Amino acid sequence: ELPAPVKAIEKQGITIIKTFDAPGGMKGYLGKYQDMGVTIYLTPDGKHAISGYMYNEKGENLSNTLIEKEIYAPAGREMWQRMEQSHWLLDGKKDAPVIVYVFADPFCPYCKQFWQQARPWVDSGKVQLRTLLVGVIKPESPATAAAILASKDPAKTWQQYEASGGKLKLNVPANVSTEQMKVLSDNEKLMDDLGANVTPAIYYMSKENTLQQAMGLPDQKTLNIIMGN
Amino acid sequence: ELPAPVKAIEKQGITIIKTFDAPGGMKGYLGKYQDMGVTIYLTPDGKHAISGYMYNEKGENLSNTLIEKEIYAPAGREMWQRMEQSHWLLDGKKDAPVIVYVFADPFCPYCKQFWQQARPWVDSGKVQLRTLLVGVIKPESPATAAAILASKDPAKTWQQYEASGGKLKLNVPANVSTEQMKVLSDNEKLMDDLGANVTPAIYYMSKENTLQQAMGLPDQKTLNIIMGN
């Protein structure tokens, strides 16, 4: 079964996930209390256990690094791959180090404004925006988004669209290709699967490789973090 | 100086108080982050330290026992002794195990009501109420309190006063003895030194010997805890 001192913590409403190797002859237990992951460390004697955070000489919160790397990071990377595999429109260099996904709609003032705030990082080649168009805000939203997706170069047309603030003149299609209705439908299901009920819905990876999100127009702090700044 | 991993925690905004003996070859550091006391444990290797709570086989939160016993318990016992040394009126057996201090005023509905709630525990001989009269609620408050303190048996007169709801008939003194004005003045300074701006202000010791307080009319939970129940 479980060592007495750890069983005592378990009764404090904690559920153990696995055991792991702790430094200094200690045994570690990774667990959770509601949504919060926790680390427990059995002392050498075996009669005591500390519920807390382990730090090394450099000040790294090891407990935090392990929790994120085992409890949080996994699920997020799944949604990141699913986002990567979508038909997103590029903005910036295809090899920009920082990748930012954003669900945008043709009639979303905040989308245009975030597009604007993003200019510096994108022009620098540090950040690339990957836009997943959707049509969920206005009656004409789908017809417009599809008319954007259905052009000679959809990524450029989205740019010119955000830039001009929409005044762009282009041939609406007589038929919205099924391929384009699929992209819109896939993007909208993915947005829903992320519980994103606001556009723009932005997604980025933290320095510790965990999926982060942002809804609406980011304030300066959030903008700086999203931009990897 | 301080071991690297503990110095790392210290920089997280923690101030160390002293070092202590931890089990299993570990060294402990008692500290504080704002008002909260914290325990840090240097692992045997010396390269790591865990900021958290130590539990033994029986489930006792050792970290909590030490913090309260070294950070909280001291100051409270000081105010307890100062309260003990005051001229309080007895209610119940002088040898009742649980001691409860309460600052009361002659015109305080909530004082009368708490007096009422207290009946069961006091009659059982489990709890003794020690009342420190004050005169801070009404113009006639001091004159009344003093008239209570100035009687043949002040403790009984306070009882009969709470019981009868005040209708008690007794000889008001022509002169309020200086001794009685001193008690009222000492009680009022002590009440102030406790930041008690509400009457009744009740004070009791927790099972871990730390000073607890309660202002106004206690709800059922608080009443039960105050009564040691």
Domains of chain B as residue ranges with CATH:
1-71 (3.10.450.70), 72-229 (3.40.30.10)
B89: CB partners within 8 A, 6+ apart: B130, B131, B133, B154, B155, B158
DSSP A88: P
Distance in angstroms (rounded) separating the CA atoms of residues A63 and B93: 54
DSSP A116: H
- 3-state SS of chain B is CCCHHHHHHHCCCCEEEEEEECCCCCEEEEEEECCEEEEEEECCCCCCEEEEEEECCCCCEHHHHHHHHHHHHHHHHHHHHHHHCCCCEEECCCCCCEEEEEEECCCCHHHHHHHHHHHHHHHCCCEEEEEEECCCCCCCHHHHHHHHHCCCCHHHHHHHHHHCCCCCCCCCCCCCCHHHHHHHHHHHHHHHCCCCCCCCEEEEECCCCCEEEEECCCCHHHHHHHCCC
A43, A54, A62 ranked by CB distance to B24: nearest = A43
CA B175 to each of CA A53, B57, B179: distance values in angstroms, whole numbers, following the listed order: 66, 64, 11
Q: Which residues of A touch B11 (CB under 8 A)?
A: 59
Q: Which residue of B has its CA nearest to A25?
A: B44
Does A53 contact B at CB distance below 8 Å?
Answer: yes
Residue contacts between A and B (CB atoms, under 8 Å): 101
Please say whether the beta carbons of A111 and A162 come within 8 A.
yes
**Beta-sheet strands, E only, within chain A:** 15-21, 27-33, 36-42, 49-55, 89-91, 98-104, 127-133, 201-205, 211-215
Alpha carbons within 13 A on the beta-carbon side of A26? 30
Provide the sign of the torsion angle of the four alpha carbons B60, B61, B66, B68, taken in this order.
Answer: negative
Please say whether the beta carbons of A6 and A16 come within 8 A.
yes
DSSP A131: E
Please say whether the beta carbons of A3 and A43 come within 8 A.
no
User: Can you read off the two tokens belonging to residue B171?
Assistant: 């000889």
Distance in angstroms (rounded) separating the CA atoms of residues B127 and B120: 9
Distance in angstroms (rounded) separating the CA atoms of residues A28 and A37: 13
Question: Is the CB of A56 less than 8 angstroms away from the CB of B48?
Answer: yes
CA A25 to each of CA A20, A43, A84, B117, B176: distance values in angstroms, whole numbers, following the listed order: 11, 8, 42, 55, 72
Distance in angstroms (rounded) separating the CA atoms of residues B27 and B52: 13
The total of other beta-carbon atoms located within 10 Å of residue B193's CB is 10
Distance in angstroms (rounded) separating the CA atoms of residues A171 and A148: 9
Distance in angstroms (rounded) separating the CA atoms of residues A189 and A191: 5
User: Can you read off the two tokens belonging to residue A107?
Assistant: 């009639």
Does B16 contact A at CB distance below 8 Å?
Answer: no
- 3-state SS of A177-195 is CHHHHHHHHHHHHHHHCCC
Q: Which residue of B has its CA nearest to A28?
A: B50
Does B13 contact A at CB distance below 8 Å?
Answer: no
| Solved with | X-ray
Residues facing B55 on adjacent strands: A49, B61
Comparing CA positions, the residue from B51, B15, B47, B198 lying closest to residue B110 is B198
Resolution value, angstrom units: 2.4
Q: Which residues of B touch A9 (CB under 8 A)?
A: 55
